[PDB]
Design a protein around this ligand. Structure first.
Ligand SMILES: Nc1ncnc2c1ncn2[C@@H]1O[C@H](COP(=O)(O)OP(=O)(O)NP(=O)(O)O)[C@@H](O)[C@H]1O
Ligand SMILES: [Mg+2]
Ligand SMILES: [Zn+2]
Lengths: 95, 703, 43, 636
DNA sequence: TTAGAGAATTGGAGAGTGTGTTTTTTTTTTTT
């Protein structure tokens, strides 16, 4: 998905903590609303939350030689072959 | 001792496997043997030559090609992209003790040698890098956007104890965190420590940012970018604006700042560089081999080398032989000089291609962009004064004013190509005056007062007023440029699409021939291959410096004086010294084309011819006859001089036959080197001695 | 369907992630090395 | 490292699906055996060879493609036996320091890798073909040595603990053990084990084959295994859907109870109340802050945390959880149980008891004996019961053997402090065998045969006449300890005690049974009053705490015994305890109280008796606080 | 045989120590 595209996302809305507030044995903390309190990892700080959509799938909302050879189904092969052999395809395509 | 093995079969991972002592020693021996036994297709021992060319210049860095490493030693090529840090360390050690076998005293010059891998086939688009590539060797391409300065980074650090004299032993510095001692073994004091700045070993460090090239995939989208780390000799391998090709290890580490920025355990990434090439400098003199030099210097022996080089410029363009000649002289260039150490004059030659539409002027500029290294291309309104010369900006992170390179500074020893030059704005077009003559760009802005070097050859293309060139007017009367900008162009070129049905047939047949020849699937001399021409140009511009000692001063002065007299009555502008120096530069350029260390009379004749033919082209169509007669008769259209050599040969034969009755090629060339007629090859390819029944043979030397 | 196949042939005439490919095509050569070593030892 | 690497890499190279061995590979494996015999105490060579995966890389291909080279093959077999040797044998005991415990874990990890590798069917195919030839031949010292080392290899590969962090596998996904058993089935080595157990010619291997069978069956229990019919897969599909449905509905109900417990206003919606009639820990009234909805079902420990009980005081926990093996493996194991019970049980068990008599068995092989005595007897009880197929272990000798083993394990548990948990696990095995023998003597009374009815009456008469089988339950209850014995031990003990008292009740109420042990008089209620002790009721209440997690039969047994002890013996005041009353409060407040009709009715009965006594006098509340000896007769 | 008093071993609560914390000028391109 790129910017400007209208896309359908499927996944789950998750809550993401303010990770800057949490100290751990792995790494220290890195420091308007109140937030929660009381955790050992949180220390004396207070933890806020934000909503993030964890998308497991993305698709558009309305949708090479190898690619053409794979995509072309038998009806499409017959159609393009008949068009190639169509006499006066010039005027037919113009019209 | 540890025993040799089949390497490719093991139960360990690749990193663990090559870390173990047995296979490490086997890999070491294999790479040593590969260096000491690899040969070229012709049988030349490649790495003996490369190591000698390294140890001569003290470059302390050995470039190895993957595409023949895979040919010689399979398993080394197998393990290399999988465990690159370990294998490259082993390669460094093996290469070091090969180099100390070839040059035993080279440890005085350097104690460590880096193996740099080139032509890695697993190339990757810069935005296509994923977690699958982590800790593996990759190759990517992109434009360098930012560079730090060259900084000293700790590599083997010794710490002074915080409370006593003791030096805590060497810690190997990492790119992930600052290694630390904890507490001293002589006395267990702990915490802060002092670095021993004298005994600590440092290494060069430079961090660059590279992003996708603007024309590659960023079609209105923002480009992706990666950071890369250059260490030791790789620093100063590139600058901002360089379209580099980077090989390196895709390395990742924990970054708390990214973790708090994203709210997830996101790891920062960086490319530990192992080789930096450039996609415009596809060939360089530091990479030329002895065979390349040999075949270049063999080509220079041919008397047709000037015609071969002229025919070799833009070979898919029919005709325009004068244009190809002028572009060759500009592409090779003259010799810069500073007589007295107080008075600079440029060596570079500037060209202007004026003419009507559909005449391959822009196509010529595109060809010059492709063939020449350090070339750039710009067009009309797309260019600006500031972008052409140099620009002052708030630095992105410091926010202090910094000067930055423009077009003519990025092409400081290359070619700046300015297409549709007539259509620029005047404020944009007048910005290149200092760069075009004084070859500096002087900036006095925002507290910056300095002058940058711009030793650039400007090749420009333009249309006349109204698009179509009219022969009824002189060049000055229909070009719309002024004298200060016209006179800075050493070579003026006029191309006209006038109707001539036979020439139109020849041109059209050649164009159709090019279209059918290049399907995806006036020359008379055959060109060089373009790879050979690139090698020839880059050799000639560095390994040759033509000197000037005598050029027939009175001839050139007389020529220039009556050229000024005729120009006073008509419409092109030989400003006093610039045209004299244009001729000097063109003579030096012709000597450079022939790989001559000293300028000769033939080169001077060629320069005079170029100047005069360009001047005749700028005249009105009615005036060309009188002007051409004026310069052609007196001012040295020295086509050929066969009659003197014919009668010298006939005199020598008459004396010899008279002597015989009562080695003649040596007798001929002795008198030819006595009299100033030394270019005897024209006499042998001319019919004058042939209808007099004379002939030549390099073996028998009888005539 | 022979003419349709001929059109496909004309289309293919005009018709004109890689670490694993490299490893496989290289492992073929290493297999050849093992075979030649085995044959030379057993000869 | 380097010399070991050179010697192991010297063996052979693998080409695609084929293995080519170097000519000195025999001497190479001999060198590897030499290094293994001269390991350090850290088992360094075993660690290094496991890290190198030389077994999987070299020895398995050599086994499966070069078994014809017999001098190489037997050396390879011995090398694999040495490599696959269990870690407890490698180190002697489970270490107790970080470094050696790490070494133990590393060796164990490589054993996991070996077990995962040996599931390839070709290995056991070659082993079964070889052992088929050997048993056709059976005889030499080298031949029986090779048979012993093949059987020890199978024992070793079966006996590894599964690393359930990596084998974190769902209800009937095939574990590594399942795949190993399926490989054994496909190779047909199960038929060779059945031949060894059924044949009388080579009974010295019967003990080893018993060990192999005991290691084959570890996740399974006979009652579930015997019921695996051919159409069980469709049934289990519907059962899984039903179980998911009821689990989800239960969770939703629990969520709604929590939601109604707290208010519908946000957490910081303040306001504080005073409860005028309720003193705080000071002299003033309590001030409550958590809202009216928390006051609606007020508890005086809402804000408190649990206590950190010390390590030496913490209760024991279950070492296993009932993941089923894959359904195909379950079908194969049911067929194996059927063929073993039909063709193999009597002769093998007689041979193993003969081995115990000859006293050449190892120090705890009767644990395997009692395992089989529980397992296959219970398998016979499940589905069509036939004592004729299992007649040997119905002898009174087995009851005496179990009793002496159980009392020995009991004494060693009470004395051998450092190994008390393992002695508890051995006592649990003995108790399970005793329970299953009580079950089968109960079962055969329902059978139509007068001969086995006579045998049942004989067994019941001598077992209830001999006192030491009778007093053992009081001994176990009096010295039961949750700190050492898991809840499954207490569950099995309660089930066994209920069954034993049921059979004793029936025997005394249908026949005189007037004397016991030197005869001395006996009546049934005299023995039942022995269980009227504080420790016994305490243990029964301890099992009653998990009434939701208990099986329905366990709840029936516990409530039946407690109702007997309270009502028929008229000692309700013994069961008056405040912890017991907390248990009843949770039981009555349970939303699922309708599913426990007998338990809730018993709770209401005993509570009514208590409140009668409380209406008589206020002393009942104080007496309710403390556990109580025979002075309870004051309250009654 | 079962239960209470004196002595021994180890968990952890608490004290101390070390460390961490809009607004102005100048340029550049494009908008009129
Ligand atoms: N002599 C020639 N030989 C081959 N191709 C030619 C020749 N003259 C013109 N062309 C073709 O004409 C096309 C236009 O070239 P181009 O360089 O854009 O012309 P131009 O001189 O720039 N005209 P203009 O941009 O209007 O000033 C290209 O495809 C050239 O290859
Ligand atoms: Mg153009
Ligand atoms: Zn010190």
């Amino acid at each position: 998905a790129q910017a400007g595209d209208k896309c359908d996302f499927t996944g789950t809305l998750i809550v993401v903590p303010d990770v800057s507030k949490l100290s751990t044995p792995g790494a220290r903390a890195e420091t308007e609303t109140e937030g929660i309190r009381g955790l050992r990892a949180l220390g004396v700080r207070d933890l806020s939350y934000r909503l993030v959509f964890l998308a497991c799938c993305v698709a558009p909302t309305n949708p090479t030689a190898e690619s053409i050879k794979n995509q072309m189904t038998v009806k499409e092969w017959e159609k393009v072959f008949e068009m190639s052999q169509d006499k006066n395809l010039y005027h037919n395509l113009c019209t | 001792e540890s025993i040799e093995n089949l390497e490719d079969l093991k139960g360990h991972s690749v990193r663990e496997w090559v870390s173990m002592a047995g296979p490490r020693l086997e890999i070491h021996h294999r790479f040593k043997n590969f260096l000491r036994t690899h040969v070229d297709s012709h049988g030349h021992n490649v790495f003996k030559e490369r190591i000698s060319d390294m140890c001569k210049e003290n470059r302390e860095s050995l470039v190895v090609n993957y595409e023949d490493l895979a040919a010689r030693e399979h398993v080394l090529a197998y393990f290399l992209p999988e465990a690159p840090a370990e294998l490259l360390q082993i390669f460094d050690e093996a290469a070091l003790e090969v180099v100390l076998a070839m040059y035993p005293k080279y440890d005085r010059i350097t104690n460590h040698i880096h193996v740099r891998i080139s032509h890695l086939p697993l190339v990757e688009e810069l935005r296509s890098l994923r977690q699958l590539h982590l800790n593996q060797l990759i190759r990517t391409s992109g434009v360098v956007t930012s560079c730090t300065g060259v900084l000293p980074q700790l590599s083997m650090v010794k710490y002074n104890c915080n409370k006593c004299n003791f030096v805590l032993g060497p810690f190997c510095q990492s790119q992930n965190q600052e290694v630390k001692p904890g507490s001293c073994p002589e006395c267990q004091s702990a915490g802060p420590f002092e670095v021993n700045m004298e005994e600590t070993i440092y290494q060069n460090y430079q961090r660059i940012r590279i992003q996708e090239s603007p024309g590659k995939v960023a079609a209105g989208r923002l480009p992706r970018s990666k950071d890369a780390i250059l260490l030791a000799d790789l620093v100063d391998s590139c600058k901002p604006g360089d379209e580099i090709e980077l090989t390196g290890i895709y390395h990742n580490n924990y970054d708390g700042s990214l973790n708090t920025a994203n709210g997830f355990p996101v790891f920062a990434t960086v490319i530990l560089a192992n080789h930096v090439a450039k996609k415009d400098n596809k060939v360089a003199v530091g990479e030329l081999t002895d065979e390349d030099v040999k075949m270049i210097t063999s080509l220079s022996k041919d008397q047709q080398i000037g015609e071969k080089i002229f025919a070799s410029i833009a070979p898919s363009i029919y005709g325009h032989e004068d244009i190809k000649r002028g572009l060759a002289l500009a592409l090779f260039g003259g010799e810069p000089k500073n007589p007295g150490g107080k008075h600079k004059v440029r060596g570079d030659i500037n060209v202007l291609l004026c003419g009507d539409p559909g005449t391959a002027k822009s196509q010529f500029l595109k060809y010059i962009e492709k063939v020449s290294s350090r070339a750039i291309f710009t067009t009309g309104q797309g260019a600006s004064a500031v972008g052409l010369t140099a620009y002052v900006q708030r630095h992105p992170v410091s926010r202090e004013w910094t000067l930055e390179a423009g077009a003519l500074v990025l092409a400081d020893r290359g070619v700046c190509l300015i297409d549709e030059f007539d259509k620029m704005n005047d404020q944009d077009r007048t910005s290149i005056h200092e760069a075009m003559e004084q070859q500096s760009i002087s900036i006095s802005k925002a507290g910056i007062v300095t002058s940058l070097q711009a030793r650039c050859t400007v090749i420009a293309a333009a249309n006349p007023i109204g698009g179509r060139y009219d022969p009824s007017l002189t060049f000055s009367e229909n070009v719309d440029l002024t004298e200060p900008i016209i006179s800075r162009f050493d070579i003026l070129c006029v191309v006209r699409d006038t109707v001539d049905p036979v020439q139109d047939e020849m041109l059209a047949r050649f164009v159709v021939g090019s279209h059918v020849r290049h399907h995806p699937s006036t020359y008379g001399v055959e060109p060089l291959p373009q790879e050979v021409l690139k090698k020839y140009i880059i050799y000639a511009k560095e390994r040759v410096h033509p000197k000037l000692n005598q050029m027939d001063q009175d001839k050139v002065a007389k020529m220039y004086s009556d050229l000024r007299k005729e120009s006073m009555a008509t419409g092109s502008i030989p400003i006093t010294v610039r045209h004299i120096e244009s001729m000097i530069r063109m003579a030096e350029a012709h000597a450079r084309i022939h790989l001559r260390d000293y300028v000769i009379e033939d080169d001077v004749n060629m320069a005079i011819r170029v100047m005069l033919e360009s001047f005749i082209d700028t005249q009105k169509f009615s005036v060309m006859r009188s002007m051409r007669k004026t310069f052609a008769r007196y001012l040295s259209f020295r086509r050929d001089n066969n009659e003197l050599l014919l009668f010298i040969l006939k005199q020598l034969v008459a004396e010899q036959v008279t002597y015989q009755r009562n080695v003649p090629e040596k007798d001929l060339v002795d008198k030819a080197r006595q009299i100033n007629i030394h270019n005897l090859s024209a006499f042998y390819d001319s019919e004058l001695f042939r209808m007099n029944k004379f002939s030549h043979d390099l073996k028998r030397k009888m005539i | 369907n022979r003419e349709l196949e001929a059109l496909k042939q004309r289309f293919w005439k005009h018709a004109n992630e890689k670490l694993q490919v490299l490893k496989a095509k290289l492992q073929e050569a290493m297999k050849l090395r093992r075979f030649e070593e085995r044959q030379k030892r057993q000869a | 490292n380097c010399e070991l690497l050179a010697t192991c890499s010297a063996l052979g190279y693998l080409e695609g699906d084929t293995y080519h061995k170097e000519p000195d590979c025999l001497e190479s494996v001999k060198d590897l055996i030499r290094y293994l015999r001269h390991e350090d105490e850290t088992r360094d060579v075993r660690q290094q060879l496991g890290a190198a995966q030389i077994l999987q890389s070299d020895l398995l291909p050599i086994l499966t493609q070069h078994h014809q080279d017999k001098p190489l093959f037997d050396a390879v077999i011995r090398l694999m036996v040495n490599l696959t040797q269990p870690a407890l044998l490698c180190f002697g005991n489970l270490p107790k320091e970080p470094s050696f415990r790490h070494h133990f874990l590393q060796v164990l990890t490589y054993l996991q890798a070996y077990k995962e590798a040996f599931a390839s069917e070709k290995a056991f195919g070659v082993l079964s073909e070889t052992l088929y030839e050997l048993l056709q031949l059976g005889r030499q010292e080298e031949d029986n040595l090779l048979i012993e080392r093949i059987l020890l290899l199978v024992r070793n590969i079966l006996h590894v603990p599964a690393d359930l962090d990596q084998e974190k596998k769902i209800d009937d996904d095939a574990s590594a053990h399942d795949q190993l058993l399926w490989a054994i089935h496909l190779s047909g080595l199960d038929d060779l084990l059945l031949f060894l157990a059924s044949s009388s010619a080579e009974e010295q291997w019967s003990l080893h084959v018993l060990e192999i069978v005991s290691l084959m069956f570890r996740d399974q229990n006979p009652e579930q295994l015997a019921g695996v019919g051919q159409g069980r897969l469709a049934q289990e599909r519907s059962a899984d859907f039903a179980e998911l449905e009821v689990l989800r509905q239960r969770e939703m109900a629990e969520k709604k109870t929590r939601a109604l417990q707290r208010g519908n206003r946000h957490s910081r919606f303040g306001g504080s109340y005073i409860v005028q009639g309720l003193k705080s820990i000071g002299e003033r009234d309590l001030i409550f802050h958590k809202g009216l909805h928390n006051l609606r079902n007020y508890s005086s420990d809402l804000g408190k945390q649990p206590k950190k009980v010390p390590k030496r005081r913490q209760a024991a926990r279950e070492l296993s959880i009932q993941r089923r093996s894959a359904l195909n493996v379950r079908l194969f194991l049911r067929d194996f149980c059927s063929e073993f019970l039909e063709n193999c049980y009597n002769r093998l068990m007689g041979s193993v008891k003969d081995h115990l008599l000859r006293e050449k068995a190892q120090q705890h092989d009767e644990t395997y004996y009692m395992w089989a005595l529980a397992f296959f007897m219970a398998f016979n009880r499940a589905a069509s019961f036939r004592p004729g197929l299992v007649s040997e272990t119905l002898s009174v000798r087995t009851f005496h053997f179990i009793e002496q083993n159980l009392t020995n394990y009991y004494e060693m548990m009470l004395t051998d402090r450092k190994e008390a948990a393992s002695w508890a696990r051995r006592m649990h095995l003995a108790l399970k065998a005793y329970q299953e023998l009580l079950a089968t003597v109960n079962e055969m009374d329902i059978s139509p045969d007068e001969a086995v009815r006579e045998s049942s009456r004989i067994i019941k008469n001598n077992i209830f006449y001999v006192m030491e089988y009778r007093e053992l339950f009081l001994a176990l209850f009096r010295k039961f300890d949750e700190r050492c014995q898991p809840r499954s031990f207490l569950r099995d003990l309660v089930e066994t005690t209920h069954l034993f008292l049921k059979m004793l009740e029936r025997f005394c109420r249908s026949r005189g049974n007037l004397v016991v042990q030197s005869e001395k008089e006996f009546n049934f209620l005299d023995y039942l009053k022995r269980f009227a002790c504080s420790t016994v009721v305490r243990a029964y209440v301890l099992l009653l705490r998990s009434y939701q997690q208990n099986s329905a039969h366990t709840n029936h047994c516990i409530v039946k015994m407690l109702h007997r002890l309270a009502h028929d013996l008229k000692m309700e005041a013994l069961l008056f305890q405040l912890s017991v009353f907390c248990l009843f409060n949770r039981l009555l407040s349970d939303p699922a109280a309708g599913a426990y009709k007998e338990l809730v009715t018993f709770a209401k009965y005993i509570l009514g008796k208590f409140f009668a006594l409380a209406a008589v006098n206020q002393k009942a509340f104080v007496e309710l606080l403390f556990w109580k000896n025979t002075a309870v007769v004051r309250e009654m």
